[model samples]
Target chain A: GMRQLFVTSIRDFEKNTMGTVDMMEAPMPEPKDEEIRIKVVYASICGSDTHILTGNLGEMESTTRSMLPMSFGHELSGVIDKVGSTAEKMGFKVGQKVVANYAKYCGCCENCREGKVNLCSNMGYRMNGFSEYAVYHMSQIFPIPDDADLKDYALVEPLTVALSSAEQAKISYGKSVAIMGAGGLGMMLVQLARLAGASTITVFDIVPEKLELALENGADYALNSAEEGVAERAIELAGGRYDCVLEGTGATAAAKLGLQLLARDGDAVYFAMYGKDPILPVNLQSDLYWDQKHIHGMIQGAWQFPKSIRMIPRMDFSKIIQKEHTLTNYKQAFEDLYSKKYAKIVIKMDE
Target chain B: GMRQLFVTSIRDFEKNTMGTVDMMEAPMPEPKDEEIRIKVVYASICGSDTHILTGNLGEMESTTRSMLPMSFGHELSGVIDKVGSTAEKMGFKVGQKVVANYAKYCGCCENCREGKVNLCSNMGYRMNGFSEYAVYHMSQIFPIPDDADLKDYALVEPLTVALSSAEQAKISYGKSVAIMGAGGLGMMLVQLARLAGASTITVFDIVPEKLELALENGADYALNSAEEGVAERAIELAGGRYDCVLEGTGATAAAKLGLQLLARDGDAVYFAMYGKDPILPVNLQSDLYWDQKHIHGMIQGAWQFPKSIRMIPRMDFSKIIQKEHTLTNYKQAFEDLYSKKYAKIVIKMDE
Candidate 1:
């Protein structure tokens, strides 16, 4: 028998009625010619999953056809259990540890051809990750090192997101960088900015513990923007203005503040999207019309997943992982995330 | 004796004291070694000149050192009357029709060295152009065709501005563009977009006459945004979105509108500056964060001046020029501009 979680109904977030667990007695199906079956090991909960489960993201109601009895997570790691003849011919083998792209993108679209797979024209039409067993095309599977820790594989998705944004901003040596949040993605941004050799790394967040974590990662300066006049203090700490600002908070006010912190000819990488629509009061004459600033938004990692996977072995992921829970504790794991008790909570299936 | 206009004082705009002009009588200075004196032929009035005279641009007050006795106007064409020994050695000769750069950019600055003279660190530090006879370095002077009309020479400065913006926008063949104003610069943008092989060109303005002029000058679609719901109409006519948007109106509202008309990954050139600061309500997540749009602000034509002079003979300037006014009728010329009666008004310095 195999067990899986199904988002049967997202009636209320606080009442714990959003999802239910199901046990299936049927045997696992065999992989087809070009397919590879993956036995799920660890699956991580993303911010989008939390928002979607709560039904707070209004636009998602129409964009993603929400059918009941559907699996939800996209960031996962697994061990290959079965590989068809064609998949084996394509280099995929059983018993290999791997991570796969859940957002299936056609490599032939104009944007895809230009290496922008995140903006795929055929996106938002695929789902199915939070399950006991999953099957995928051979092309979607990416191999991890044989000795790599399976616990850290779930972070590849978020790390790719950070790398994608850094690439979008064209970060380089001697550039000053500022991150507007100190959460999971924000900490990754700090590390990547340092790896890119940024001269100054600044971060702003309301939590002191998060700010401390950011400094430990690579940030040279941290500000608790919960205190008034922190934006000015942030500029002072950065020695005037930042060359690139990555907005990871997904707040409208934070976005506006990020604009004010930019240097002339600066690039603002809006790395996060608010689940709800948010409008910012941007001063066109002073903010953009005078400074010649630029803003870029990223949806996903695009062509950065491969690079991110290669760089993971060199990154220090010691402090990022919080805890791992079994399938029976899924409700409690989500509750802990909702209560902001852990930076990341992973669901372990093979434990 | 030579004559030049001085800004004695800038009075109330509505009260019609926009600027007090003076004709000064003084001996013409000799052209030093490596210098040539220009017998000012035509000096055109730009929107900046109008804004400066009215004291609407607050930054210009501190920048220009408004001491009430400074020469005005930077757009002009002249015939060389006196050439020094070194000037003659450098190929500059008397009786040659020429145009010159007024913004004496320090060619040694980092920005200037990189060919971005408009952002020169030593900018807003040099001024002098509204005079009958002027001396300049041979390097500052660029000769037009021997048989070219002197009246059109005044346009070289404004045309250089147009070229600079088009280059910044990276206009290429088969691209679509939208201009947010139908004034003089707007008309120039239309023609330049056409010359750059843009497949579709659209313009917006409040006046019907200006919109008609836009249509006559290579614009594929013209919208009178004064009419309710016309911006939407303009977008539909342009096939939904423009690859590039040139904001020539300098109004913050128009700048915001231009952002809305841009395609995903499009560039928005903020070619004009607002006299007064204005704020715009921008949807950060959707407008910029999701679409990946870019905005650039240009102060003046940089290294494009020579290119502009060379390309002028190939462009048609027949409909751009309105009635020319003499030095004595400069007040009336200013009055016509204030009333928005001409697409472009020129001051015949030699008349």
Candidate 2:
């Protein structure tokens, strides 16, 4: 039997106009043998999603990516409606609640083979994020506990990124951690670093509210990014330089500053994605000789889904809760984000 | 008693210019309680020494450099003339031929404690080299085989540099190697890389004569710096790409090209010093992620003085050498070097 629902049709289907968030009745597509199809219950918008909608995420010079017509969110989590028999055999069964990672990576690309599935080749620039429901490969879906909060669970994708980078660092049990950026990713890294055995964790952010959120998320210390002598303060309190610099700011200046703040042989894992060709002014001669520091970029969090998802029950993701909204309130949500008035806002889908 | 000998001296002492390279009075300096005085038999002038005379090397702003105004050379091999009784107990004995390393590191510094003695903090700047004899701390000297040819033995300093870097890179046998300069350090690395069991050893140089010397000294392939499709050709011959890039040319363009030619996850060891900053355009986000590459610098090399000294007797050094000179013929050596006419010119000490 097929079920019908009432939803708004596309507005100005041909023009790049505003206040045009649209929805429509659609057929539920079947999943490939290796993929799973899910009824997306909750999908949240990110800064990147806004960029994509504003005609700026265009890779080439042309084609204002209107391929998807309406959907514009990616931070998604939902219940599986139809897991192809193959995916079921692969352990992802139908009727389970799960979070579908935004990155649609082929299992065979060079990046995928090397465990960097975030930069997958099969997915052309458009990673369909917005709207109600979508299909995903079994590998792209992470099963969450049935009792999980959908509003909080939807933030799993970015948290997985932070967790994966922290794991890659192989940080010592009692090491000092420095997190650059107190935004969404920085807050996540603060929690991950704390649970991953960091003795002391410091967060840096230009926004006062974000810094306050970082402290609430288990950061040992927090500093205003606008303040002078923050680096010196961090080094002095940690008793030395930071053993790890977890960078969440895509800004090149933050990357270079992170390099300067690292301890001897410290690992600086860059987690932010930049829109511009970042020119990092690193002092190579000095870094190589005295510090032996390392800079590594965290590609989209992959092969780490299970580990990050398993922490849902333990992390109490509800602690990160600031506000909740529905599809009708997205305009207010975008305003909150644009004005930097909220640490995080989640849009709910009542399944 | 001091032995009579012909020596090179500064006829005109110029504080701000290059001193005269001619004959002068000479006597053996006494060994300190913790020192050993060496009777110089042979010495070599590297591009470093020449740079010193051109008013380019020794005229630096740093107060920590261990170079002084008296010496015109650093690479040398000699027999021990005298050793203090206390110094003998510390590991020096008379009648032993020795090759002193220029590092003269302080054993108590962090660098020395960490086994990076070459970057030690307490050595006096300006090591003397033009006299008939020189004195040094017992800690700064290492014994060499008496039966080894003194002419060939003088090549140890550069060889130590090459060996130290090779060791740091963990380069094993059968690895493909490409040295980006066929000058002194490059020549030494080619020989060491061969002895270390490299399967494909390549050298790139603008000078054909240097290429010839590189081939003669264990390089399996030589490519001109201006050759067409050099990167592709070398990669084709290597069957993939170079596993290691040994950069010795003090040119930024060479470093940039080296980055392009590296194999996946390959390392580029920069051994040359840039006068200013080297702006290498590396796509660390995209390219480095695909290849998992590393770009690191190698400054003064490692501190395996004893081990590096022992490897010399097992390899042939004469093949790399192009000519020999004395301090008196410094002008000739400089003229030949500046004219790009010699591969390696050893500066001899008059006896």
Candidate 3:
């Protein structure tokens, strides 16, 4: 096994600060039976990637944290370089344009056996697409069209997440909606909400530029949530209260206000990852039985890879990528990520 | 206007203590243009009825609290003594065996306009079935089978609530379920869960007698939550954790344990009225995104009254009525309810 280029974090990513990550060398991974090796063309940085570098995802107890100096990335696109016998027998071939699901779902797990693969009990998200090359099992690797560009396909993973959030909203014609955030998922959520025939959509963000982008993406009204009278205005615009609300940002204020804006019998999708510190105040007397509201949360896109791929040609996914950097300059790209200036950022290997 | 037999609160019902209620005289309500006059036959006491006498629902703040000395009761079946012109024109007969919805929904309210009559924004639960006669709007009255017993039909209201909670659970064949509290709602929930083909059902209650009643009502397992290692036993019976959980008790411990018993991707229905004191701790990091669980709450039976009534004759609802008292002896029945000995209790009016 030959050594290849990799990146390792030297410091914790605490409180939204960019940690020190340095390039190192690791043995090139080999494909096992029913697996494929890929030369990563491009990999996108997700909002959660920064958390991985810091090891501060306060999710479940009795679980291992993101280890130090680990090469981690999930949103990626690559070209297959080699395939195991079983993978080839399954119709996978070398030189194929492909993307991989970060979390490998075992079919025998309880959730998967119940036909809920997204919440697979044995979800091992061990793939490191940040490296120059990575190996993925046959089930996790999905082939993209040969005519498609790798950079556009790199962001499809996040789109599947947004699609799932959109589907959960159940927005029908004439339904009023409100969304918190205007990041990549928020941007995609705004677009998808517009496509759902929601009568009116309000996009909330503290950043003016993200608000502008949200409006550009077909949102009916874009307002700064930091404003004094914004809540009244949002409620007024929806004719009383939002029938559907989505929290795509993990900020405590966003989550709280999103729930507050919901009308009677409103449905909300809390799709963001909030860490341990923000313990939401749940008023059983008000936010629950009396209001008759519903709250739903999702982990990953459940059985939606094929559907997301089919829509790649239908929607203009290429524009979602606003900036790119070569693999060597990924540090600058990650630093730029904190500004929230662009919709998406990616690192191109061997550029 | 003729003075009729009524009950007036002499003292406040605070903290589970029965307040003094005395027989008083009130004008018998006459039928409005689109209303009907019901000769009160029998009225059952709901779990929430106790909260009304004390004026401590602790739900919405802007609304007024339950005014004491006010005639109150909702679960009722009576005879239509006189029908207004519009009601008679709409096919209501004076001799019809009838039951009335406690909360009359105005068709023009926002919730009712959306076809959600259960959560009607203008829900006015002003009908006092604890009297000689009460007037109900045309929209609030529903006819029962002429041959059906008046005492059994009185409990159809609570059954509607249990049916709604049952339907919202979406239980299928072989699914596991957990229900808290073996009161009227929980008793019906156990039976309905069995009817839905649930492979296993675990019912929790503090009283050992209620646990036996839960078993009698078709529950597969009846466990006392007061016992040590009961939580482990419940999980063991379900094979891991409950797939569907319902909270029908306002007890803080029951509500907290119900949430903890939920499995990954579990759906929970918190349909009980927990007052102001119990603030639930919600861990968004774990109970939400990581576990990918969903929580649903129901205010009242949404559009399920007809369905609940259709199933009334089919199920043995007479057994659900464990005790009955005449109008003059209502105080003893109200006091007897706190013992949790009976599945249901009804106070007959104008004996």
The best candidate in terms of TM-score = 3
Question: Cα deviation of A126 in candidate 3 (Å)?
Answer: 4.0
Q: Who is ahead in lDDT, 1 or 2?
A: 1
lDDT of 1 by residue, A120-162 (tens): 7776433445677877777778899888787688788888888
Lowest summed lDDT across 10 adjacent residues in model 1 chain B is found at B57-66
Ranked candidates, highest TM-score first: 3, 1, 2
TM-score, prediction 1: 0.87
Which residues of candidate 3, in runs, are more than 4 Å off? A1-7, A10-18, A58-67, A317-319, A338-340, B1-7, B10-18, B54-68, B227-229, B338-340
B168-202: candidate 3 lDDT, tens digit per residue: 77776988899999888898888889888899899
Please report how far candidate 1 places residue B143 from its true position, in Å: 5.1
Tell me which residue pairs clash in candidate 2. Answer: A72-A130, A73-A129, A73-A130, B9-B22, B66-B125, B66-B126, B67-B125, B67-B126, B68-B126, B325-B348
| lDDT (Cα, tens digit) per residue for candidate 1, span B49-75 | 766666565655565544767777888
Worst lDDT run of 10 residues, candidate 3 chain A, spans: A2-11
- Report the C-alpha lDDT of model 2 over A1-351, residue by residue, as the tens digit: 222122122223256553234444456567888878777677665645444433233243134433434444567787888878889898887779898776666778765686656656575332444445567777678888888776677887767777877875556588889888876667777778878789989888888877788888999888876678878888888887888887666666677678778876577776565545755544545665434555555566566677767776667555565666765665566566556556556766543
- Shift in Å, residue A82, candidate 3: 2.7
Candidate 1 accuracy as lDDT: 0.78
TM-score of each: 0.87, 0.78, 0.92
- lDDT, model 2, position B234: 83
**Judged by TM-score relative to the true structure, which candidate is superior, 2 or 3?**
3
Best candidate (score: lDDT): 3
Clashes by residue pair, model 3: none
What is the fnat score of candidate 2?
Answer: 0.08
